[model samples]
Each structure stands twice: as C-alpha cells, then as structure tokens.
Target chain A: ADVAGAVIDGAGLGFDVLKTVLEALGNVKRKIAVGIDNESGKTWTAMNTYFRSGTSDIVLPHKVAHGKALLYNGQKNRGPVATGVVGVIAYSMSDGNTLAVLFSVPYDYNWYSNWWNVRVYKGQKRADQRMYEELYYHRSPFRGDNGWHSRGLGYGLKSRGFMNSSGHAILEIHVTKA
Target chain B: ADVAGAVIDGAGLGFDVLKTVLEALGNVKRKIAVGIDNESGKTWTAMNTYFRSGTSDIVLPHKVAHGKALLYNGQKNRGPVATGVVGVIAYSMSDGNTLAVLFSVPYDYNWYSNWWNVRVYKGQKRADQRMYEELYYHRSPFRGDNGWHSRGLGYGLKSRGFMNSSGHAILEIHVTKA
Candidate 1:
C-alpha cells in the first residue's frame, strides 16, 4: 500500500503514506516521517538539506512537481544513541524563492522541545546553519503537541498542521495560498 | 503592537499580534487568530467562509498580496456558550485553484478535539458544508498540539506550524512554495 525509499507524486496532504514510513522505523526512540506536498502551482527542485543532528540515508535534492510529494524519514544520531533529529531542508521554487523547513527534535528533552519552522527566503538561498538559526531562534517556533497549528508564511501562502510530542513523531500539514 | 479589527499586512507571523487578539477576547473561552500569508508569488482574493459552529463579525474574503498576511480572529457561538469554532475559509488564487482552510474548534472539548485541514481545491469552489466535510471527515486532520506539523499541499506549497490546546487557541503557520 506504500512505497519506501521513493518519492510519491500527487500524494495529497494525508497520513496513510506517512504512517507507512513511520511503521518502517521499528522502535527507534526518536524518529520523524516527513511528507511535504507541493501545491504552490509551480515546480520545485530539491536544493539542499542541513542536518543539525540525527542521520538518514534518504535522498535529498529531488525535483517535485506542482502536485507531488517529497517523503522522508529520519532517526536520532547514529553511533551515539541520541534521542532525536534536528535539521533543515530547502527547495528552490521555480519562482526564485527558497522554501525551507526546520525541524528540531532534541536529543535531550530536558533542555529542548520538539519544534519546526518553515519560511520563504527571498532569492535562492540553500538551507544552512544561518538559516537554521534564523528559523529556530529568531522566529517563533511551533511546539510538537500532537495538534494542528496554523499561520501565514509570508510570500503568498499559509501553513497549518501538528506533530506528536512522543519520540515517535508524525507531522501532517498543508501549505496553500493565503 | 497589534491592530485589532483590521488586517495587518506584511505581518511576519510571530504570536504577539495573535496574542493581542486573544487577550482582547476578555474571557471568551473559544477563539482563534488565523494568520495566512501570501507567498505563492501571486495574489489572492477573499472568496468565502462557511461556519459549522461558531461566530465572527470579522470581515471575510479580503484580498491578500504576495508577502502580505491575512489575519482574522474567530470566536465561538453567539447566544450560546460554545467551547469552540468550526468552519472553512476559501481564497481564490490568481492562478485558478481555490485555497481552502478548514478549522474545527469544538464547543466542547470533552466530545471533540481541535482539528484543522488545508487544501488547494481545483478551480474555484466556495466554502460550504460539503467542503467542510471533505476537510474534516474525509481528509486527515492535524490536531491542535501546540507544536509544528507540516506537509505539502499539492500545488507548489508546503505548510508547517502548530496551535495550542486551550479554547484560547493561537494557530501559527506558513504556506510556502514546495
């Protein structure tokens, strides 16, 4: 019913495929199954992804269509038994704007919380530490409370969704025109 | 620092403006500040909104521009002590798709959970019960977990953000090109 290690095109904003990716993780304490659907009416090319923490062999920099999905999964840092994954992934929209998503799942819950941020950086800037810091520290972040949240992501779109607080996290969201 | 009863354009979407709206409610148990950004490299117009269970005197169907924000505050039922607001709002993109956002804040949390869904319906479809049902029951909903959850909203956009659990809910999100 689902395909692993492959991108799903025309995959609407739903959880069936995301659930499939989640179940594939087995018992990893901290993991995330991210399914990003493109509905901006433009094509996008995978630009880059910056991993602040954790590990994943999942492919990045793949081209996504106007109605396609970039599905990915990530687990805690390898070789260290870390508790979570933290990073940012970026894509270049055909319109010259950069789409960036920042997800932070702390290896230590005592000091940090599960959070994520998305933004449209002017021009074609790739995901990097500066971008990560701007999203994580400069901008207000949404917590992982297993409920849907929404707000305007400037440029011409609005985003909404939620993620669980547990080590096993499933995030579902939609970015559409405002 | 917040403008009540007026659309705040160019709002970058932090919670201060939203918090101001929440505080203005005085004691209204169920209220939501929805911020939708226009970042699709195009403009959008306020189409319509369908209310399932709630009331709002705030203006609807306003035009939002690229890099601008459409901020709206909705409260629970009128003439009744409802606990939440449930409805769907639609915007017509310059391109052809209808961007719809469905938000359900139950009047009674004991019987329901906070859920929200976003979609880019093909062509121009106004918000109605049918559209509400499609987003509420047919599509997978994101819970109000006060944390960020995101996914692609088939077109060219990806959404990410979160909302709190209380009746005084604040939804923060971004819709950007995927």
Candidate 2:
C-alpha cells in the first residue's frame, strides 16, 4: 500500500474502510461509501457538508494526517423513495485552501446520470449550498466508469480516483502534490 | 416606461406583471417575484431553471422579445417551514451565450446572508444542478441591497440591477450591449 497522498474509496487503501462504511449503511435503498487519502504532506480538517436532496449524520471536518485516509457515508431517507442523495463535503487543508467532493445518485435513472467531482477552492471555504452548486454543476464531472479519472486541483496538486459503475456502491480517490 | 432591455420586478416594466405573480402565491411564507426585460436589441429564449432548495410552478425558458419582458415566481412548499427558496433561471441569447440569475433567501437569517448573482455563460447551456452549482458557489455573488449592482456579462454586454433588501419581494435588471 503506497498510501502516499492518495484517496481510494472501496479500492486500494479504502477497501476495508469503505466496506465498513457500506455495512454501516445496512440495507438502505440508496447509499454511498467513500474514502479519501491525504498524502500531500498536509493535515486536513473537516469543514462542512452540503446536502441538496438527502440527509446524513456523518461527523465532518474530521481530522486526518498527511498519510491517513478519511472515510464517510451517505444514504437516502426511508419516507420518500423518489428523491436522490446529492451533496458535497468540504475540508480545509493545512495549506489554507479548501478540498471539496461532490456525489449524486438520482431517484430516477432517467433524469440524470450518476456523477462526482473534486475541486480545490482558493480559500478556507466551508461546504455549503453555494459550494455544493459549484462542484456539482459548474465543474467538469466524472461518471461511474469503474476506471481512474484524474484532474489538476491547483496549488501544485492533482487528484485521481475510481468509482464503481453503480454510483451508489463505493468511491475511491487519491490526492497528492504534483 | 423605459423598458428598453431592462428587467424590473414590482418596478418599472414588471410592476403589473410581478404583482400578478405575487398574488398567485396567496399567503405563502417565502415567495419571490422576478421580472426581466429584453432590451438588448436581440431576441431571448428561456433555457432552464435550477433550484437548490424550494419549489415552484412557474413556466420557465419562457420566450421574450428584444423589447419585451418576462415574469416568474417561486415559493417554499407548505410542509416544511424551515427551508428557503434558492435557485437560478438561465436564458439563451441570440448571439450564442447564456444569461443567468441566482436568488437565495435562507430559511434562517443566521445561517447565511441573502444573496443573488448574475452571470453570462458562454454557449447554449441549460439550467441544471451543475449550472446551479457554478453560479451560486463558484462565482462572485451580490448581497440583497436596495441599490444597483453592475457587472460585465461578456460578449460585449453588461448587466445592471437592483434587488430589494428583503430579497423575496422584487428583483429588477437591465442588460445591454457595451
């Protein structure tokens, strides 16, 4: 396990951790398990989580070391099965910038495809409705292709990741200095 | 009325039209009446509407001529009184760009301030979750002040506008070629 500033959800460094997250979700109709590794020689503190049409109780801004990984989960509510779980989680990096991730799983398969995006904001911004909008809409997003996707996240850093085709199963990602 | 390429709600060109839109909402807790005039010497067509939170029944992507104006409204649902109405409306211009407006009125004033933003996106993109994220979070936003705020919308055009302090009552704007 090279663990060097990489984020992997249900794969590589996240395999065991995300399995635990998925098991915690139980038999929910829709759910997601995520894992991200930080190898950029900086500490990350949980900042905020923005949910557009879902709910979660995960403790955010959870701190992780430069060589550690962060794990989180989300699930749709039981009442109305027609709405999707869409949101973003933001973290403030030791370098004074923000790291954000977005995930989406529509209630109906016909409306929109499952997508996710990662971005590095220029400031110590929190995850909020506004931040969610930027990551989910304005930025280029990656589909659940079950292959690695990469992008430059500014600040001399880049990110790479793999997500399952189901979009709800597991997402793995890695972030490190360029 | 000097409605030339001006967008006014509850003022100027939108006084009568927006009044009717507000009346249609009855006694809804949080509602917004919006009007935009197309005086840019070019035809405009409705493209899309993106809502971060809230609901509305107004027809969107509604067409308006170069000398005409369009009116629309939005209101929170009856069940949850703790949420707000936040979204964006996008219009396609004849010159191959997009015009967008964003509105936000948080359920509680303590969480975040009331804000709005206007932007011009290159190309004929439609309003969707991704577009909402870009305008609301990634761009510079305007606070709800009862004064004029202006910005360049690229493509040789600029936008100037006034939104009431309440954010929900009225919004007026003008778009013209620079």
Candidate 3:
C-alpha cells in the first residue's frame, strides 16, 4: 500500500458538494502523513499498516505538519506491493492535485469526527469509477496519472500550482517526501 | 443497491467532524430522496435506482416518504443494503419517525426552492454535532431517529409526524426538521 496524494476532482459535480467536503476538512486538526518522491520513499510502510485498521489517523510524518495530501490511491501509491493494496479517489481539483484516500466509512464510525467525513466530501464530488484518465482532467508537472508532488494540505504544500493546503480545505495533508 | 436509511447514530469521533458533514448536506438542494416506512412500505423504485448513480435525482412520492438513504456515502438520500458495506452516520432523532438528516449547507438542485437556505439555518443550530449527541438527544415522536420528520430547508417534506412529501416544503414554511 502507498499514498497517492490526489483528492479527486469535483468540477463535474455541483460546487456545493465539493465545497462541503473542503469546508469539513478545513477544520480538521489532524491529517494523514503522506506524499511521494522517488528519493525519499517512506510512506509505503504507514499506508500498508493503516489500511488494515481503517480507523487510524494516518501514516503521518515526524515533524508532522498536517494537510500534506499525496499519491493517487493504489494505482499510484501501491508501490512494489500490489497484492495487498487499498485506496480510493475522494476528491480532485479542476487543475490536477487529488487525494487517493482509498478508505471507506465503515457505517459505524462516529458522525462527529472521522476520515469518512472528509472522504464523503470527496466521494460525493467524484465520478462512480476508479481510473486515472477518468478521474483527472488535463495534466502538468505535478499531475497526470504518474506525476506526484510532495506538497500536502496539512503541512501547507500545494498539489502543483494550486493553493496551499493550509486553508484550502481539500486534499489530505502531510508528507515526508520532498 | 438497496436503501437502509439508518446512518444517524454519531457513534464515534468528535462533534466537529459530524457537524461539518451535516452543514454541507443540509445546503444541498438535490437531496438523495430517502425515507422511513412503517405503517406502509412504499418506496418508489426510482428511490432505489438513483442512489446507485449518485448523480440522479431521487424518486420521491407525493405525500410519500421513507428513510431512503443508501450506501456509506450518507446519500441515496443515505440508504441501507449495509455491512460488507460502509458509510457515514449523519444524524437522526430517536422516534421511529426520524429525519436521520443529521445536519446540512444548502446546495441548489432541481428540487423546489427556499428550503436550501432555510435548512442551513437549522443546520447551523445543530452542533448538538453545531456545537453531538445533544441536538439528537431528548427526541420524541416529534424527535428520535424513529420519528425523522422531513422538513428540510431545501424542499420541505415533514415525514409522518409532520406534512407528507406531497409538495410540503413549499407549504409547511418551517419546523425543526428544516
């Protein structure tokens, strides 16, 4: 399992859906510690571990700045381990940056605070399939199916040319890559 | 592909997360077309179908209603078909007539009108996930998850204890459900 830092795009859906999702994540004090970089590959361990529990905060980084979303779900974050991969695209921007959260609500989690809450915001804004071409539109330096950036919402890293994650409200945050 | 209509427990996490999710949903205009059936089990098929697509409008009844929410998304209006499934828990009173509508923002859809804005008003007041277990506490026939009345601020319905979905939002004017 690996982190793919893409939040899925909501341009196809109503602004309200995506807005709701972003606003919810905006208030989150904690976030996943993820990001991608061929040079500093340290996310695979946490990604594999947390997906097993589905209730953990995330495989966050040490200096641990929050809001540093990364990777693209399994297709991008799976790394070398493919057989046990698990992930999903919750939300995406019209530009490129996306969040490949790859998790589910579990139906029984609390309604108050949980990753699902953020996931819902992204899910409601996404299409009903799982593919890169279908999920993202256009491509750029830090985008495309394979292009990943180390910037995340938590630590204030932008996906590419988009807004920083600090007050951006969308995308998972944090990354140890850079 | 079935509607369970029972995601309003707020079983875990903090109130901030649930509150954010609710406020967002409350503002959406094109509702998921969910319900709660008791004396009658009339669930329009469109009611069941649209949830799968996630982009279609709900199959609503005239004075008809059901707790039709589907999947873990807290949508379909938020239905069942549970387990092997996962989802988020919005909010609902305790009575058999629950709105299960946990909370809301106000997004425009093809519904009616006027309700989206109003729902936000009530939604803001509801940290009881607005401020968790409190707004939904002390429910009755007029409250309780069982007595979910549908006075959505988007398009009024009033469930059973209130008006029927028969062009009510345009009629009732206001209630706690909104």
Candidate 4:
C-alpha cells in the first residue's frame, strides 16, 4: 500500500487526496475504504479526490448505507451532494476512460436537514445517454431535534469523545485510483 | 292638560318624543336638559323619535360621560347609539346630521356592569358642543375579556363590575332638538 500524508492548507485538499488514491491503486480492480476523524476535513477530501481522478461515468455500488454524499460531476462543472442513503452516478467527458466507483456513507452523514430518501432503479429503455459521474452521500436518518442532539453525540463518539462545539464535522476520504 | 292611559293593544307607539318636547318648548332653547335612567332605552328611542319627526337636522348631542348618544341622519335607515366613552363618531353624514351616539352607564347601578357615566353635548360645531344630558350603560373596556367581573374599584369605592353579568346596566341617551 502506497501511503502519504500532508497538512491541507486550504479547501481544495480533497481533490488532491482522490488523485493520490487513484494513482496509488493503479489500473486494477480494487475495493477502497476511507476513514477520517470527524474534524479531519474528510468530506472535502473525499469529494475532491473522486472528482480529480475518477472518470465521468461513475456508478456507486448498491447496499451501501445511506448518508450525505458530495460529488463534483465534471460535466456540470458544479458540485452537488446526494442528500441521503441512495445509489448515485455521475458522468463526465473530461477523461477518455469510463469509470465506476462503489461507495456508501452512513445515513447520518448526508444533508438530512432538508431532504428525504427514495430508491432508484435501472429504468426500462431510458434514452438520455449523456454520461456523468454519480457521487453518493449517505445521510443519517434525521430525528429532528433528537437528530441534532444525536448527531452531536455521534460526532463525539466518532471523535473518541472529542466534540466540535461548532456542530460541523470534518471528514477525510482516502481512495485508491485504478 | 290631557291625560289618557288606556290599554291600546299593538298600537305601535312610535311617538316622536323628541319632536314633542322640542315643539312644546317652542323656540325656547339654550340646550334642553334631558334625563335617562340606566334602563330607559332612551338613546335609540330619542334618535328614532327625532328622525321620524323630521327633526333629524337638529344638532344631536354626543355623550361625553359614558359616551352614550343616539345617531339620527335621514340618510341612514337605522340608528345606533354610541357606546364607548372614547371613540370617534361611528358615522357622521355630510349633511351635519349624525346617527352615531355614545353614552356611559353608571358604574354603581344595580345593573352597573362596567358602566361609565357619559355626558351628552349639543353643538353647532363639533368642538363647540355643550353638555345637555348624562347617561350610562354597561360596556367593556378591555378587549377579548369579559367585563363581567370587578377588574378594579371605582373612585367612589364602588366595585366596577362586569358588563354582561347581573350588574350590567342598559344604555341611555339624552338630546336637545334646538
């Protein structure tokens, strides 16, 4: 396993991590799991990494726990997140090779404040063939007032009892590129 | 003097008492003094009497004490007594005739439920009116609350009772035709 560490000075570190992970994995089938402490800036790190390296045609694997997932599809030139537990895919034409990535985040991690989740399936004879990359963010089931407190607790639990009083959890994603 | 008291059933005694009084006085007017008991139904009765007799053009008095008075403008098919100690004229017509009257009931009468003593003023101009009569009735001072209880005591050490309960007083009005 090739590994490297660097202090991220700014907001764009996620892209760098994705590039590094892809490069390390090389051109072979691989399963990658990225874990980061709650305040370690993992979400940005994961999203930037995925967008910087993965081919536009990315398909997230099923059976992944749903939460908040962030993605930057190269075609749209904008970043959006999957709000809850659901499969997602994005297509981009920036890279020549079509690629798919399968990942899941816990349901507690997505934008649970404003949206709910529903399932999506491969449709019968869908004609829109434009390619893009899909990013999945598994959002935790929101319990509203209870959820807010629980999320605060989860942040502490994940951080080994170190809670961020600001209610923001930093995430880091480490992925290996094929 | 003609005095006759016979039981005339259903005679519709819509007699114009104001006109009778005014005509009886026969141009001898500085502002006649009229008295109304707490339950005499005087205000509406007087104004209606005036209106029916075509004496509606007279400067009808406004209640100054309990704010009870009769309104009689020929343009209005109905007349309403002013009921508040402090309220703008409910309706005043351009013809110098008004059908808005207000008077305050006694605060100590047996039916004195939140009653106020209102004085009536006769005038050629709104500001140049002279007090001609004093009247009273049951009225509420506070919004959204039943004035049927003694919210406070009067200066005479009398209990200011509710406006709708057993202590509630009916309305009265006094007016001068000249």
Local distance difference test, per candidate? 0.72, 0.71, 0.26, 0.24
How good is the docking of model 2, by CAPRI class?
Answer: incorrect
- DockQ, per-model, please? 0.01, 0.01, 0.01, 0.00
Please give the ranking of all candidate structures by TM-score, highest first, separated by commas.
1, 2, 3, 4
Q: Which stretches of candidate 3 lie over 4 Å from their true place?
A: A1-178, B1-178
Task: Tell me the number of clashing residue pairs for each predicted model.
Answer: 47, 17, 95, 73
List, residue by residue over A109-175, the lDDT tens digit for candidate 3.
1331112111112222432333322322222112111111233443223322111111111223222
Better of 3 and 4 by lDDT: 3
Q: Please state the Cα-based DockQ of model 3 relative to the true two-chain complex.
A: 0.01
Q: 3 or 4, which is superior by DockQ?
A: 3
* Better by lDDT, candidate 3 or 2: 2
Can you tell me the CAPRI class of model 3? incorrect
Our model 3 lands, by Cα RMSD against the true structure, at: 23.4
True contacts kept of each: 0.00, 0.00, 0.00, 0.00
| Winning model by lDDT | 1
Residue-wise C-alpha lDDT for candidate 4, range A1-178, written one tens digit per residue: 1111122221234454466446533422211222222232222112112322222344332222123333332121112221222222321111222112222222222243211111112322111211112222343322111001112222212211111111121112212111
lDDT of 2 by residue, A19-109 (tens): 4564555444667787999987899877656667555533342477899998877666433236667778788889899888888876666
